């Protein structure tokens, strides 16, 4: 037992962990095997994670320790294969700590949906995963509808949506803001030729900005009119869903 | 080898269909022949062996029209010859 404790402390020292850091992994560990703790950090750093980001994620989610080592290697290899590596892991892991707990299949068809059904390039998909880790949790049906809503009704191409992080925003909120502008006349859906008779407002100020300034800048209308429209819009959607 | 109506509807198109048995390789020991044989079999064959209470009984009892195997009939001839001699 003692010799095992000396070895893991030495390995952590060579791997870049401070004495203050090393002791708080021990506190987070709850009955996990010392060798199972020794190789779980090995795979995390082998993936590319720095020491102090690792200490953060496992202390937020200690359930990762009680995981078989074989599945960790398969998941780690899959993450590297899809283009996710050093630096990008920190963003996807922090916002989506349950990435390592879910199966390989729900990730498999999601990227297949993005690459084939949504016709995204390999680089764009990796950027979507890194910038928006929240695409994994929800089902494929509403993501495809969200993507096609922007592609057709808004007339925005692939490099614009992968740069503006459009997918991470709520489907309800984008529907309310886009439909209101279209009925206001401030937004016009591009025609077959891709030509708009009026300058389309940039996606940045429609969604990234708060509603108070969004109403003030682009909508140019009072707040209570928007609230009345929001109730009206929500009424039509539930009738449309009931009809369909 | 046969035909199947799509969605079990007579008015739909008729498509060719092929059904194949599930094949497993297993180890069988023959008491009479004193040998172990590796022969691909089906789940039906194993059930027939269990009901017959032994591979030797199953080979010696089942007629040729149900064995449907030249190897099985050769097993029967060897078993019969050993019993005869």
């Amino acid at each position: 037992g003692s010799l095992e404790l000396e070895r893991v402390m030495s390995s952590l020292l060579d791997m870049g962990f401070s004495n203050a850091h090393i002791n708080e992994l021990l506190s987070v560990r709850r009955g996990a095997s010392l060798q199972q703790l020794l190789d779980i950090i090995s795979e995390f750093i082998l993936l590319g994670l720095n020491p102090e980001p690792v200490c953060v994620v496992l202390k937020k989610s200690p359930q990762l320790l009680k995981l078989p080592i074989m599945q960790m290697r398969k998941r780690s290899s899959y993450l590297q294969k899809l283009g996710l590596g050093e630096g990008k892991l920190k963003r996807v892991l922090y916002c989506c700590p349950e990435i390592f707990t879910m199966r390989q299949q729900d990730i498999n068809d999601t990227v297949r949906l993005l690459k084939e059904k949504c016709l995204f390039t390999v680089q764009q998909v990796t950027k979507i995963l890194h910038s928006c880790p929240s695409v994994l949790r929800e089902d494929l049906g509403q993501l495809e509808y969200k993507f096609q809503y922007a592609y057709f009704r808004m007339g925005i191409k692939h490099p614009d949506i992968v740069k503006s992080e459009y997918l991470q925003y709520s489907l309800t909120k984008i529907k309310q803001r886009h439909i209101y502008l279209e009925r206001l006349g401030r937004y016009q859906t591009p025609d077959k030729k891709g030509q708009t008779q009026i300058p389309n407002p940039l996606l940045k100020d429609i969604l990234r900005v708060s509603e108070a300034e969004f109403l003030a800048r682009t909508a140019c209308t009072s707040v209570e009119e928007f609230q009345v429209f929001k109730k009206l819009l929500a009424r039509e959607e539930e009738e449309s869903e009931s009809s369909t | 080898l046969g035909q199947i109506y799509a969605n079990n509807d007579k008015l739909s198109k008729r498509l060719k269909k092929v059904w194949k048995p599930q094949l497993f390789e297993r180890e069988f020991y023959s008491e009479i022949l004193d040998k172990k044989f590796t022969v691909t079999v089906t789940m039906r064959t194993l059930d027939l062996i269990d009901e017959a209470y032994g591979l030797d009984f199953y080979i010696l009892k089942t007629p040729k029209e149900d064995l449907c195997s030249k190897f099985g009939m050769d097993l029967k001839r060897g078993m019969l010859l050993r019993l005869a001699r």
């Binding site: 190789d39 090995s42 590319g48 283009g83 059904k117 057709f152 009704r153 | -």
Partner: protein
């Protein structure tokens, strides 16, 4: 089709080997890959991608002397005829390898990282972190498969408990063990990518048939065609 592969030789040698072109056809005689055909006749020179190959009567690390570095018609990189003991074999030359150079091959794994010289073969665990590495192998004894083109260079990023992470030139990581062997440095012919063909005749010399003259708009659109949803079907094409 009475097609027989020419890669039927069973014993290694340094003599150039006569080979026959395929022309993009498989063994059935039908075209499988387009744009391949003709070109100047070439002779194959067998390359030993297993750098650590001790002789039958010897074992362990050995010194090895370079005889001549020349140009290989079958690859972008330049091959070097290297002789050691009582044998000769072909390997892949790095940036700076000339006649008279002596190069070491060793499978010994050291407690401390040994200084890496250009062209030498050392295990991944016996090299300093961040060195330029070419001719890597997936598993020990497999042989070099990656980073073989002229001018390519991978870099070792980290080693963690018997497993090392290498960076392929495609900016993609890969997991290998320290027991794998690798060559220090980058491949020769660094200026290969900046060569200008000059005329369409040169491309025919290399054995490349011209691309098809068909306008593959359908092929391009087929790979970039999406299916609108029933709610979005009314917005696919608004008349101007």
């Amino acid at each position: 089709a009475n097609f027989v592969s020419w890669k039927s030789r069973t014993k290694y040698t340094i003599t150039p080997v006569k080979m026959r072109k395929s022309g993009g056809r498989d063994h059935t005689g039908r075209i499988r890959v387009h744009g391949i055909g003709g070109g100047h006749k070439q002779r194959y020179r067998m390359i030993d991608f297993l750098r650590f190959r001790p002789e039958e009567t010897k074992s362990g690390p050995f010194e090895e002397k370079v005889i001549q570095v020349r140009y290989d018609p079958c690859r972008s990189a330049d091959i070097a005829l290297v002789a050691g003991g009582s044998r000769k074999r072909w390997i892949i030359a790095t940036e700076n390898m000339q006649a008279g150079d002596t190069i070491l091959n060793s499978n010994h794994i050291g407690r401390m990282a040994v200084a890496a010289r250009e062209g030498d073969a050392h295990p991944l665990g016996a090299l300093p972190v961040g060195t330029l590495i070419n001719n890597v192998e997936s598993e020990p004894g497999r042989g070099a498969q990656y980073i073989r083109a002229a001018g390519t260079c991978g870099v070792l990023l980290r080693k963690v408990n018997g497993t090392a992470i290498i960076q392929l030139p495609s900016k993609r990581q890969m997991q290998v063990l320290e027991t794998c062997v690798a060559t220090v440095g980058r491949v020769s012919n660094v200026d290969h990518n900046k060569r200008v063909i000059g005329k369409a005749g040169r491309n025919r010399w290399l054995g490349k048939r011209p691309n098809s003259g068909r306008w593959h708009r359908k092929g391009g659109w087929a790979g970039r065609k999406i299916r609108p949803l029933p709610p979005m079907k009314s917005y696919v094409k608004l008349p101007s």
